[PDB]
Write a protein that binds this ligand. Structure first.
Ligand SMILES: CCCCCCCCCCCCCCCCCCCC(=O)O[C@H](COC(=O)CCCCCCCCCCCCCC)COP(=O)(O)OCCN
Ligand SMILES: NC(=O)C1=CN([C@@H]2O[C@H](COP(=O)(O)OP(=O)(O)OC[C@H]3O[C@@H](n4cnc5c(N)ncnc54)[C@H](OP(=O)(O)O)[C@@H]3O)[C@@H](O)[C@H]2O)C=CC1
Ligand code: SF4
Ligand code: SF4
Ligand code: SF4
Lengths: 293, 216, 347, 53, 154, 395, 199
């Protein structure tokens, strides 16, 4: 193995915990409230309580479901997050960003197995709604990446999607595609404008609600980890070399845009992705494969 | 008819003079003369609309209720387009215990009318849902609370009381606390109903004075 | 049906009401082991009829939460700190009590408490403390059916020795001896299911030859009430076996059938091998704290008690003397709990 | 008593009841012109990059 | 070891009490006082109390309203779905003892008949600060518990 | 000899249980849906039926006032107001002008909080949470006025037969006036976030369409009538207090969709602010409760100095007043619609029959007609516009 | 604003009506076709650039920097008026003699029937209660009992911190109520002196 895996994994866990803290602190800011202050004095130590306490809660035996798949979904999310971050920071793969696109297409599985665990006729339709969102906006992300490789050329002149090489130069041409990438990244992390779940999920339509103690932790951590990976991708493609402040700022922008926006209905955001975002992304992909070489 | 907004400014009037007079003092006589078979007696008393005015109360029999209601809604001069509520009052002293009360509004006349049908436990009252769609739930509630059956109701079901409740609670002979009580049992992991026991009984305080005269 | 009095002296004066939650029953009870599986149902039966139950418990507020709902205001008294070695606390607990029920027992040994302490020392000490009072009129001790002085298992032997000590100090005590009790919170079917499903292999001592008479928890709880409603029952031991005698193999097979397990996961771990696999692990238990991983099933005492027939002696008192018909534990409401898991139309 | 909470002599000062329409600021055409200029600059930058590469 | 077990149990008490996930069974008047208690002016999220819609993810349950005979089975069903710690707070006179509808055919005299109650918050409606006082009383009850030490000496 | 054409079948008889982003209370809703479209909605009520109507029959008239506060926890004052008006009509009791002004003022205040809660909880049900928290601070400021006048923030029991329980504390009118000076700006802040927002527009436009004929047929009142084009207000058409003096304009919309009713409710808040300013400026001086001491309690010094006043105090706090035999139905423009009490008196000190007419009962009955052809998500918005309170629906 | 687009609607049938019919142009609230090139660009950029969204974004972002309204509940307490109706308390005269004279009016006026009173003649000869218990799980805190008492014996104190861990502690009795009156005597007296002016 390599020692770099540690230097990538550990910062990720710490960062996700304080991302969960940041979300509610920013909510307190919008709503003339304050960050939690009884957990400690500084508040650095708030999310660690939730994790450690969640270790404490007595386990529930699985009910009317196959055990293997129910265990499988958390492991899938935790595998995908680690692979994504360690291929964003620790690899030279010529087509690495396309590999990240592949690893984002595997996130459909975690939700889908979690839905199959329910085996409720209503839960079938709910999990299908969630995966429909994810795939529909994965298509537009794929078109935007096709746009990105088009200005991404290495010093030797070979087209590629090596993350360091797309990071090397900042292209203001690509910014029209970065707006679509930001909207789709909101869609893929199930942010409120595309958070169809919360309304459906208050009654048990079907979501990671079934998972309870440590399985439930890893899902929510993986959600924030994927959001942070999207922020890193927005930085590395469209905004130049990788900067930690820019990544966290994009995450805060996610929270702000969420707060300022209500949710969409299922047919609405699905019609947005297909009849609005996809034609514009094909028009920009034309505009980029057809702004030229 | 329907009080669609017409006047943009200076609609300070409560209503026109003629519309007020015809309903202030001719309404009961007009009803009695126009549809005499339906009406058995009429009472003019303190107004439902206001303290100062006077509003009619009409007593009719169960057979004529549907036609009287249809006449009241669609007559040109009397347009009671709205059913405010349907209610029953239990009078155990009377042979015909229940008095089914209908409250109506005419937006055009700015007036309220009260219609009473006096029945007993066995007799039924025809449903007026076809005249006013709001009646359905009100008649269902009247059936639940008092036990008055409404004929030709689309689906007469209990609304307020618990599932499996057979007694009619607002009957004057029904105990205030009822007959049963609900508790969870540990042995049978179910919530179960049991006969009533009260830790502290309801204390009825008899405040009546011999010298009072208002009691009728 | 006519309600029968609790046959306690001067009950006729104190008793009043229909016999419900808010009625007054003249029974103040100190049920040791209230938070346990057996004790909770006994507390429920006594408190349901308007009686007052004192429940000494080792500090654990969440474990004794269900007992709070059991009775009306002031009827279920929960004493916070119970120690089997503390005399003064025991005297305080039974101060106002006219009946005392002992359901305190350990399935396995630990470092803090052994079988000889809980199953022998506590009954003798409590028996002396109850005897000196005199206000206590009825004493009921709960024991296993297979308990015998000449028993290989240490648990079932110590239980019988403690019962004999109780009989010596209080001659009028009644020894309730139920079989393997089936319930939602039981340790019989729940442990068997956990063995069948979340264990690599289900070891069965010998071939399941051992015969057992399982009984439903409500039947034992009702039997306690019938013991307390008759004074003629005092001084007698009642073997509350179930309606049907079944071998352990039949119960395992029928659990596999009801749960619709794919096939039989049970294996033959014959005796003389468990006596070598678990023998060191007993010494392991006596020097380590309570651990969920291993317990009850994984002991030499369990193998020794699963090589004998835990059935009622032929000449013996039972449910018939108490005018109770025990319900079958393989059908009906008793088996609903395992039924909810899987029935083959389920999941 | 004789002193109770009464409106003050001369009455209360007036308050605002109706809504304020604040919809002033940027509109469509200027954004189109700025976007066109920024696209032109982006096009020139892409031209330079692609020749140098 | 007796010191280590104490440090572990006090840390566990801190974790359980600091992060209380309450599920609000909002029947009636008192649910809105709870709404106010979780609003901007009283920050329950500062206290670590943040409401969770489903029972499986909630450890504390607040019964705030008049329990009716029609609802008590659903109340018990929701309570049973909760995980093992499951502390229950009774808020309001209606939940505590039936209150002003006590002598009614359709009202359960106290949620204690249906579910065990750890803390009783009195009022009609209870003031929001009173509800926080009851929540702090429950937090003290959680701090008092020493489950790991009892596990060592069981 | 011409072929017949078959049809399709609907299934999916869902059960929509008690659900938090909806109108507050417990709602059990059985919905029959053809696919993702609803074909029948059958609301199941009785989950908060506390037997209020029968309990009233066992209490004296003054002992039964707190029932009306708890019928609707959002708007207490309007609910007790109809009861006290009906008792006043039967008793032939005249309210002094200061008490009439205090009743109108606090009625408008509770109207404003009701509309604030309705709009912001509806936005929360949609999924926007900022207006909701932005609103609780205003609602706290108004609860502070209640705790000042009565000592209870929610269940004041301030309105009494013949006037108000106590007089306005000194300094209250200034504080209410300051809250009024800033209220319009706060409402505009809320209005920008909701109004003009594309997602809010898409969620609410053309949802829950009602026509004037349908509203009169189903017995609807208030914002439902005024969002469809009906110029009907009880405060104007059938005044019950010094409302006749007050100068305000009915807000009217015509489409009947969810958005129109939201706009109506905002404008109603503004009209209530205007009425409050008029109340503050024209507040008279004098008695706040009726001078008659055979229907109103005497003052404490007066009971402690006079024999007749001690007798009246004793007989009013033990027996209560005797209401002459008669029947009356008095309705008030509650924030949710028209709330009326049908009171039957046989001449005793206790009501013989007290029927409560729920404004939300008829709206919940209208739910099925309105929510036909809609989707599972639209039900939440439709419930929000009805603004139903189930303690108010289930008496 | 209030104006609506032909495309944006929440109902399928209404969307069909507007898609296939031009009755919406008759209606005043809807927005009419741009009729000029510049107006077409204006509407197109408005819809495509999410303009209305950003306008709400700035007003919400004002939330980040404005003065937070919140109270640290343990350290700071919300304002409580003198009239506030809280925990009940029986009061004593300054000599130490209870003010209660067992008129039993407060039990007659209690809407919830939470007060049970039984009395006797004391050995000196006074009319005093041998029992005065209030069910605080049945109380509605209306304050009617404080209104009916002719001697100010029963008052609802200013204390709202009286939650308990068992329901039995919420069944108050004469000794507990007298102790509560002793604990809060000065505050209750000040509140009553202030309240006497009004009533
Ligand atoms: C006009 C100039 C002429 C030249 C032609 C150029 C054409 C435009 C090319 C520029 C490329 C950039 C386009 C930006 C992406 C917008 C894609 C189309 C816009 C659009 O259709 O509006 C809505 C989609 O946006 C949404 O509403 C999706 C939901 C967004 C929620 C999250 C918002 C995130 C913040 C916005 C991104 C900011 C990034 C940095 C923070 C659809 O809705 P509709 O129904 O009105 O349209 C359908 C009416 N038939
Ligand atoms: N299968 C069965 O259930 C059968 C049971 N019995 C007998 O009935 C008795 C109890 O049955 P069951 O309830 O199932 O056993 P449980 O272990 O479930 O109940 C045991 C009770 O005793 C208490 N206890 C145990 N050790 C101690 C101790 N050292 N000091 C203080 N309290 C202690 C426990 O409290 P804590 O939880 O704190 O340990 C618990 O309340 C046992 O003796 C058992 O043999 C009879 C027939 C069959
Ligand atoms: S206790 Fe009072 S405020 Fe709370 S729900 Fe009951 S009536 Fe409403
Ligand atoms: S406040 Fe009201 S309910 Fe409470 S004791 Fe006094 S009179 Fe009774
Ligand atoms: S507290 Fe007051 S009203 Fe109640 S019995 Fe005593 S003196 Fe009478």
């Amino acid at each position: 193995m390599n020692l770099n895996i540690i230097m990538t994994v550990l910062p990720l866990l710490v960062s996700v915990a304080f991302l969960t803290l940041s979300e509610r602190a920013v909510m307190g800011s919008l709503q003339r409230r304050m960050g939690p202050a009884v957990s400690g004095a500084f508040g650095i130590l708030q999310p660690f309580w939730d994790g450690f306490k969640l270790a404490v809660k007595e386990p529930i035996l699985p009910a009317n479901a196959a055990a293997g798949i129910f265990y499988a979904a958390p492991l899938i999310c935790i595998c995908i997050c680690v692979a994504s971050w360690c291929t964003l920071l620790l690899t030279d793969l010529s087509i690495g960003g396309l590999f990240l696109l592949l690893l984002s297409s595997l996130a459909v599985y975690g939700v889908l197995l979690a839905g199959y665990s329910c085996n409720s006729k209503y839960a079938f339709l709910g999990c299908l709604r969630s995966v429909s969102l994810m795939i529909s906006y994965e298509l537009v992300i794929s078109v935007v990446i096709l746009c990105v490789i088009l200005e991404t050329r290495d010093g030797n002149g070979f087209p590629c999607l090596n993350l360091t090489e797309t990071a090397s130069q900042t292209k203001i041409i690509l910014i029209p595609a970065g707006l679509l990438f930001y909207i789709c990244s909101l869609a893929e992390s199930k942010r409120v404008p595309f958070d169809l779940p919360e309304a459906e999920a208050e009654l048990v339509a079907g979501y990671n609600v079934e998972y309870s103690s440590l399985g439930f932790a890893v899902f929510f951590v993986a959600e924030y980890g994927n959001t942070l990976l999207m922020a890193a991708l927005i930085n590395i493609y469209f905004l130049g070399k990788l900067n930690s402040a820019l990544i966290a700022a994009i995450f805060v922008s996610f929270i702000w845009v969420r707060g300022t926006l209500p949710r969409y209905r299922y047919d609405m955001f699905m019609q947005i992705g297909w009849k609005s975002l996809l034609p514009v992304a094909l028009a920009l992909y034309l505009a980029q494969a057809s702004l030229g070489y | 008819s329907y009080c669609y907004a017409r006047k943009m400014t200076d609609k300070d009037y409560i209503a026109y003079d003629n519309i007020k007079n015809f309903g202030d003092n001719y309404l009961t006589d007009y009803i009695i003369k126009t549809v005499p078979k339906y009406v058995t007696m009429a009472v003019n008393g303190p107004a439902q609309s206001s303290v100062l005015y006077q509003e009619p109360t009409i007593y009719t029999t169960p057979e004529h209720i549907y036609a009287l209601c249809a006449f009241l809604r669609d007559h040109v001069n009397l347009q009671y387009k709205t059913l405010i509520d349907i209610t029953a009052v239990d009078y155990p002293e009377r042979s015909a215990r229940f008095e089914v009360v209908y409250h109506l509004l005419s937006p055009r006349l700015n007036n309220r009318i009260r219609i009473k049908v006096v029945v007993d436990e066995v007799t039924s009252v025809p449903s007026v849902s076809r005249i006013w769609n709001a009646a359905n739930w009100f008649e269902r509630e009247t059936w639940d609370m008092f036990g008055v059956f409404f004929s030709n109701h689309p689906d007469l079901r209990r609304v307020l009381t618990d599932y499996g409740f057979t007694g009619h609670p607002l009957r004057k002979d029904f105990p205030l606390t009822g007959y049963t009580e609900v508790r969870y049992d540990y042995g049978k992991k179910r919530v179960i109903s049991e006969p009533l026991e009260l830790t502290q009984e309801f204390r009825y305080f008899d405040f009546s004075s011999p010298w009072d005269t208002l009691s009728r | 049906s006519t309600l029968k009095p609790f046959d306690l002296n001067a009950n006729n004066a104190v008793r009043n009401g229909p016999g419900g939650r808010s009625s007054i029953g003249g029974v103040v009870a100190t049920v040791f082991g209230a938070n346990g599986f057996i004790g909770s149902y006994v507390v429920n039966e006594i408190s349901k009829r308007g009686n007052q139950v004192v429940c000494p418990y080792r500090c654990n507020e969440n474990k004794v939460q269900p007992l709070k709902q059991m009775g009306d205001l002031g009827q279920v008294v929960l004493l916070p700190e119970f120690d089997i070695h503390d005399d003064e606390y025991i005297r305080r607990a039974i101060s106002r009590s006219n009946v005392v029920i002992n359901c305190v027992g350990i399935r396995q040994e630990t470092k803090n408490y052994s079988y000889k302490d809980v199953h022998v020392d506590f009954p003798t000490r409590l028996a002396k403390i109850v005897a000196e009072s005199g206000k206590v009129e009825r004493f009921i001790q709960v024991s296993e059916m297979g308990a015998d002085v000449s028993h290989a298992s240490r648990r079932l032997q110590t239980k019988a020795v403690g019962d004999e000590a109780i009989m010596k100090y209080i001659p009028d005590a009644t020894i309730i001896r139920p079989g393997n009790v089936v319930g939602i919170e039981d340790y019989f079917y729940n442990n068997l299911i956990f063995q069948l499903s979340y264990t690599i292999v289900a070891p069965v001592i010998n071939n399941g030859a051992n015969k057992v008479q399982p009984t439903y928890i409500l039947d034992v709880a009702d039997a306690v009430v019938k013991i307390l409603k008759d004074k003629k029952t005092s001084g007698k031991t009642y073997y509350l076996g179930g309606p049907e005698t079944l071998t352990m193999r039949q119960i395992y097979d029928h659990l596999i059938d009801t749960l619709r397990l794919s096939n039989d996961d049970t294996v033959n771990l014959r005796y003389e091998l468990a006596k070598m696999l678990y023998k060191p692990l007993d010494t392991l238990r006596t020097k380590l704290p309570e651990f969920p991983f291993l317990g009850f099933m994984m002991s030499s005492d369990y193998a020794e008690e699963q090589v004998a027939d835990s059935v009622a002696p032929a000449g013996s008192l039972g449910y018939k003397d108490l005018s109770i018909s025990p319900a079958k534990v393989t059908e009906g409401l008793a088996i609903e709990g395992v039924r909810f898991i899987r029935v083959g139309g389920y999941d | 008593p004789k002193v109770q909470d009464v409106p003050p002599p001369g009455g209360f000062p007036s308050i605002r009841i109706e809504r304020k329409l604040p919809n002033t600021g940027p509109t469509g055409l200027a954004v189109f012109l700025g976007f066109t200029a920024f696209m032109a600059l982006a096009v020139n930058q892409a031209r330079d990059r692609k020749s140098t590469n | 070891a007796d010191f280590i077990v104490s440090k572990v149990d006090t840390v566990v008490n801190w974790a359980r009490a600091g992060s209380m996930w309450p599920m609000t069974f909002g029947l009636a008047c008192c649910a809105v006082e709870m709404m106010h208690a979780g609003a901007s002016r009283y920050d329950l999220d500062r206290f670590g109390i943040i409401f969770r819609p489903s029972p499986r993810q909630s450890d504390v349950m607040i019964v705030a309203g008049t329990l009716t005979n029609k609802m008590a089975p659903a109340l018990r069903k929701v309570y049973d779905q909760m995980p093992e710690p499951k502390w229950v707070v009774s808020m309001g006179s209606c939940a505590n003892g039936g209150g002003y509808y006590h002598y009614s055919y359709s009202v359960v005299r106290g949620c204690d008949r249906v579910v065990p109650v750890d803390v009783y918050v009195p009022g009609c409606p209870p003031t929001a600060e009173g509800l926080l006082y009851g929540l702090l009383q429950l937090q003290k009850k959680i701090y008092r518990s020493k489950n790991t030490q009892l596990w060592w000496n069981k | 000899m011409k072929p017949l054409t078959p049809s399709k079948v609907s299934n999916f008889t869902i059960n929509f249980g008690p659900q938090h982003p909806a109108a507050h209370g417990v709602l059990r809703l059985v919905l029959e849906m053809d696919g993702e479209i609803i074909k029948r909605a059958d609301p199941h009520i009785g989950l908060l039926h506390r037997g209020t109507e029968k309990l009233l029959e066992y209490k004296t008239y003054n002992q039964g006032i707190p029932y009306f506060d708890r019928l609707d926890y959002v708007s207490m004052m309007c609910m007790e107001h109809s009861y006290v008006l009906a008792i006043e009509q039967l008793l032939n009791v005249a309210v002094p002008l200061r008490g009439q002004y205090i009743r109108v003022l606090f009625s408008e205040i509770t109207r404003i909080m009701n509309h604030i809660l309705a709009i912001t909880c509806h936005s929360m049900d949609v999924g926007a949470l900022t207006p909701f928290l932005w609103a609780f601070e205003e609602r706290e400021k108004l609860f502070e006025f209640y705790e000042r006048v009565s000592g209870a923030r929610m269940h004041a029991a301030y309105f009494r037969v013949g006037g108000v329980a106590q007089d306005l504390p000194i300094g209250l009118l200034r504080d209410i006036y300051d809250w009024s000076r800033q209220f319009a700006s706060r409402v505009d802040e809320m209005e920008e976030l909701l109004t003009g927002n594309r997602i809010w527009k898409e969620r609410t436009i053309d949802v829950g369409l009602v026509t004037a004929q349908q509203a009169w047929d189903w017995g609807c009142s208030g914002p439902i009538l005024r969002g469809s084009g009906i110029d009907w207000d009880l405060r104007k058409n059938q005044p019950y207090d010094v409302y006749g003096r007050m100068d305000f304009n009915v807000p009217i919309a015509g489409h009947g969709d969810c958005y129109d009713r939201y706009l109506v409710r905002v404008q109603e808040m503004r009209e209530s602010l205007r009425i409050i300013y008029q109340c503050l400026n024209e507040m008279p001086d004098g008695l706040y409760k009726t001078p008659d001491q055979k229907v109103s309690p005497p003052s404490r010094g007066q009971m402690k100095q006079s024999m007749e006043s001690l007798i009246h105090h004793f007989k009013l706090f033990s027996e209560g007043y005797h209401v002459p035999a008669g029947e009356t139905y008095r309705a008030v423009e509650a924030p949710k619609g028209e709330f009326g009490v049908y009171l039957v008196s046989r001449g005793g000190n206790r009501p013989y029959r007290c029927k409560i007419r729920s404004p939300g009962y008829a709206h919940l009955q209208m739910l099925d007609m309105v929510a036909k052809g809609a989707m599972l998500a639209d039900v939440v918005t439709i419930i929000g516009t009805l603004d139903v309170v189930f303690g108010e629906i289930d008496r | 604003g209030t104006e609506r687009r032909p495309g944006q609607s929440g109902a399928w049938k209404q969307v069909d009506k507007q898609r296939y019919s031009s009755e919406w142009e008759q209606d005043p609230t809807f927005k009419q076709v741009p009729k000029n090139v510049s107006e077409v660009l204006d509407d197109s950029v408005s819809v495509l650039f999410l303009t209305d969204i950003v306008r709400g974004m700035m007003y919400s972002a004002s939330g980040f920097f404005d003065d937070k309204v919140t109270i640290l509940y343990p350290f700071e307490k919300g304002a409580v008026s003198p009239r506030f109706r809280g925990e009940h308390a029986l009061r004593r005269y300054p000599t130490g003699e209870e003010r209660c004279i067992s008129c039993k009016l407060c039990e007659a006026i209690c809407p919830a029937q939470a007060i049970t009173i039984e009395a006797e003649e004391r050995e000196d000869g006074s009319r005093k209660t041998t029992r005065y218990d209030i069910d605080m799980t049945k109380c509605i805190y209306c304050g009617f009992c404080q209104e009916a008492c002719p001697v100010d014996a029963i008052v609802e104190g200013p204390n709202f911190e009286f939650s308990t861990e068992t329901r039995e502690e919420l069944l108050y009795d004469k000794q507990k109520l007298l102790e509560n009156g002793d604990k809060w005597e000065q505050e209750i007296a000040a509140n009553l002196r202030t309240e006497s002016l009004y009533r």
